[PDB]
Amino acid sequence: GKLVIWINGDKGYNGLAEVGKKFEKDTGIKVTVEHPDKLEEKFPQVAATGDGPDIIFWAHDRFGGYAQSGLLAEITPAAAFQDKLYPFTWDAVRYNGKLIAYPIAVEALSLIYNKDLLPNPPKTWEEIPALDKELKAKGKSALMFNLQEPYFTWPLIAADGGYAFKYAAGKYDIKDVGVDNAGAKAGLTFLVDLIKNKHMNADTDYSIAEHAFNHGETAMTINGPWAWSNIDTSAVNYGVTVLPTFKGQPSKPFVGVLSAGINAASPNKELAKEFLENYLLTDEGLEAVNKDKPLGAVALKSYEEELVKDPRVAATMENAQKGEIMPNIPQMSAFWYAVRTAVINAASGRQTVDAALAAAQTNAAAFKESQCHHMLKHLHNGARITVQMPPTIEGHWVSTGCEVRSGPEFMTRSYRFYNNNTFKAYQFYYGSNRCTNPTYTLIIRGKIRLRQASWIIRGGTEADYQLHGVQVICHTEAVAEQLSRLVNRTCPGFLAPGGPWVQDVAYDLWQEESNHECTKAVNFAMHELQLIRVEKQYPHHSLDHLVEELFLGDIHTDATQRVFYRPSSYQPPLQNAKNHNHACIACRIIFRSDEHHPPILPPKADLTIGLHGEWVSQRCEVRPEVLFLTRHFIFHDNNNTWEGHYYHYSDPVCKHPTFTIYARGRYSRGVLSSKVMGGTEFVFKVNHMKVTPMDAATASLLNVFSGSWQVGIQQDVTHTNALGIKLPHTEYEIFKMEQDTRGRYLLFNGQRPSDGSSPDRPEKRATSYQMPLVQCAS
Ligand SMILES: OC[C@H]1O[C@H](O[C@H]2[C@H](O)[C@@H](O)[C@H](O)O[C@@H]2CO)[C@H](O)[C@@H](O)[C@@H]1O
Ligand SMILES: CCCCCCCCCCCCCCCC(=O)O
Ligand SMILES: *[C@@H]1O[C@H](CO)[C@@H](O)[C@H](O)[C@H]1NC(C)=O
Ligand SMILES: *[C@@H]1O[C@H](CO)[C@@H](O)[C@H](O)[C@H]1NC(C)=O
Ligand SMILES: *[C@@H]1O[C@H](CO)[C@@H](O)[C@H](O)[C@H]1NC(C)=O
Ligand SMILES: [Cl-]
């Protein structure tokens, strides 16, 4: 029942707050206006957890990334309202075909000069140096602007041909970057000259340059419309004009459109759209803000038709069309950080123009932290994870999505462990990989008592459990028929005569007070409860937003072996119903469900497999046979070749390496699976394999059971006439690709047979998957 707004402190917050009081007048809703430091990236963190302001104000360049992460709500404007604003302003706030924010103002930088000191402002950048020396004789300077933010330096960088990214037939091509172009080098090299010819100071930030121009110590500055207000109260005659040209071509400022976005987790979205559509985006509202600190050009054609008469706004628009309109694609944050570091370093002489800017082509589209090598060193997105020793399993634990057990068996879990040491577990089964159509549900009741740490599985806790009962409920009329029949064949006599099962009725499959049981029919076992591990992550170091993950024992890939299978690895984690990720919608749906009302998971569309690229593990993976490992895969779709790195460790946190395997080969794209809905079949050939021992124990064993092996030396295992390996080896694989909540792609490969054997025959292809790998940059 409130409205919180975040706006940068270089804009008119008090003006916006006054459009807010009129909201309080007509509707009685408080509007609170805050200008947090570095708000552009306070927003991604607080919003990801469900928190944050209701409305976020920023240029369009950063909103595409917010939307990709699911932080922005789609805005619902009437076509009548949409006509009020200019089409290009809407085009800037459009991501993936959806409108994601309300356009407010069009901003571009311009040349601001003191007419008293400089009645005729320079027309070219190259005449600035001589101009400097010979105002320098009067104890003044020619040009001073903020060199700490690349927004103020870009105009010069783009003049000769430096292009942030390439616009190709309606697309911005992140594979065509021009920060290391010859054109970019010229602009930065020129800037460096002035910084080295004592014409400009490397330290100069916004505050320093603003103080100088507004006190007449410099004759020129580069700034935006927001800056005009203070100069106006600086008793200094000043003019706004076109930016100096560089090497005959004009300075190209990056054009940004100030926009208001509605938090995807806002409880007051109708009020937010109400405040923006009918209070702010009005001739009265925009004026109230433009009086505080000028917005320059505006998106409302009504007000724009009037402001365009002010010559400052016209120069703003002249430079804007001389410039380029910022892309909203999510790679902008990495583009800005790379160009930022380039400028600060070359200005400081830390890196040669070419060298500093050379890195900008290696860091433009992706953060260094998104590269495969960093992700391997900092797992879980560099989260700290605290392991609960001894674990506490009390609470409600739910699945995070549509799990796949071997079979395939598409299912979700809902497990309640009580303080009396008793438990009620729901296993919901479905007919598809979307978990939208329940087939049958299992209700498992019994008792569980945690023991002590496992000496077999490092990081696991052993547990003892006892079943009291297993019941099954069929949710379709067909399932009741099929299962009753399957129960009949499997245990002839379990079903009394004329007892065809009916839907929505719980039937006993296992009672501890009887020797009559047919758990074999569904190949049921509950040995997952014998191995337990809890991992916590406290986001923002707070108990709230804490994510608790419960890891239970893994399921055998062969259903007939589950009764005897004695866990050595983990199932995918469950999350605590009270302490889960805000983006987990499945958690809540599963939490609010029961044996008679199964959880219906949100529909997501099957994605098409695009192996091209590099993929790495997200966590220290645990494979059957207590094997800790991470994986790095490189897929060449150009020649259908693949390389894989398997890094093995002895600890559940993957810090003590033991051995490393390198494999390379060829793969054949295959057919969509009919056995495993949502999966695509593949055949992989391993042609080459290299082994690197990483500890003395592995080197010793290799030397004993065998080119002598030593720690850290990679050795091919195929000589010309090791451990008995047989290369070439053929593998029949199953693959699926999905997208996580902030739009990163996940690659799932076939679960490795629980017995340790290989899928070396088509009938041995997996019907389940391993934990997903995430896409990374090289
Ligand atoms: O310098 C990189 C940043 O450029 C723009 O930030 C501008 C912004 O558009 C303007 O309203 C503000 O007041 O000035 C800053 C530059 O200091 C992008 O919008 C940012 O996302 C970039 O990081
Ligand atoms: C992924 C298909 C080929 C896998 C063969 C690579 C060399 C075999 C040694 C690694 C163990 C098998 C694990 C492969 C499964 C995977 O990690 O994707
Ligand atoms: C254990 O506690 C739960 C929660 O109060 C309750 O539903 C269940 O019946 C209890 N069982 C026993 C044996 O006390
Ligand atoms: C159970 O299976 C047996 C053998 O397949 C069959 O003869 C019998 O008819 C089945 N039960 C029913 C009631 O169909
Ligand atoms: C496949 O292509 C990659 C790069 O596209 C190259 O490095 C590799 O040598 C090629 N392999 C074969 C067998 O053509
Ligand atoms: Cl992709």
Numbering used by the authors: 8 to 713, 721 to 735, 739 to 795
Task: Reproduce passages from the article.
Adenomatosis polyposis coli down-regulated 1 (APCDD1)—a conserved single-span transmembrane protein containing a large extracellular domain—negatively regulates WNT signaling and plays important roles in hair follicle development, CNS vascular development, and glial differentiation. The APCDD1 ECD consists of two closely apposed β-barrel domains (ABD1 and ABD2). ABD2 contains a large hydrophobic pocket that accommodates a bound lipid. Collectively, the results of this study suggest that APCDD1 serves as a negative feedback regulator of WNT signaling by neutralizing WNT ligands.
Therefore, we produced, purified, and crystallized a fusion protein between engineered maltose-binding protein (eMBP) and APCDD1, collected X-ray diffraction data to 2.3 Å resolution, and used molecular replacement with eMBP to obtain phase information. Although the resulting electron density map provided a good fit to the eMBP half of the fusion protein, the map of APCDD1 was of insufficient quality for model building. Recognizing that the N- and C-terminal halves of APCDD1 have ~25% amino acid identity and similar predicted secondary structure patterns, and, therefore, that APCDD1 very likely consists of two domains with conserved three-dimensional structures, we used this constraint, together with the RoseTTAFold prediction algorithm, to generate a three-dimensional model of APCDD1. Fitting this model to the electron density map of eMBP-APCDD1 provided the starting point for iteratively solving the structure of the APCDD1 half of the fusion protein. Intriguingly, we observed an electron density consistent with the acyl chain of a lipid molecule in the hydrophobic pocket of ABD2 in two of the four eMBP-APCDD1 structures (chains A and C). We suspected that these lipid molecules became bound following APCDD1 secretion from HEK293 cells, which were grown in the presence of 2% bovine serum, a plentiful source of lipids. To define the identities of the bound molecules, we extracted hydrophobic molecules from the purified APCDD1 sample used for crystallization and analyzed the extracted species by high-performance liquid chromatography (HPLC) coupled with mass spectrometry (MS). This analysis revealed stearic acid, a C18 fatty acid (i.e., with 18 carbon atoms), as the most prevalent species. Therefore, we modeled a molecule of stearic acid into the electron density in the ABD2 pocket; the subsequent structural refinement revealed a good fit between stearic acid and the electron density. Interestingly, this structural analysis also revealed different lipid conformations in the two APCDD1 structures, both of which exhibit multiple contacts between the lipid and hydrophobic side chains lining the ABD2 pocket.
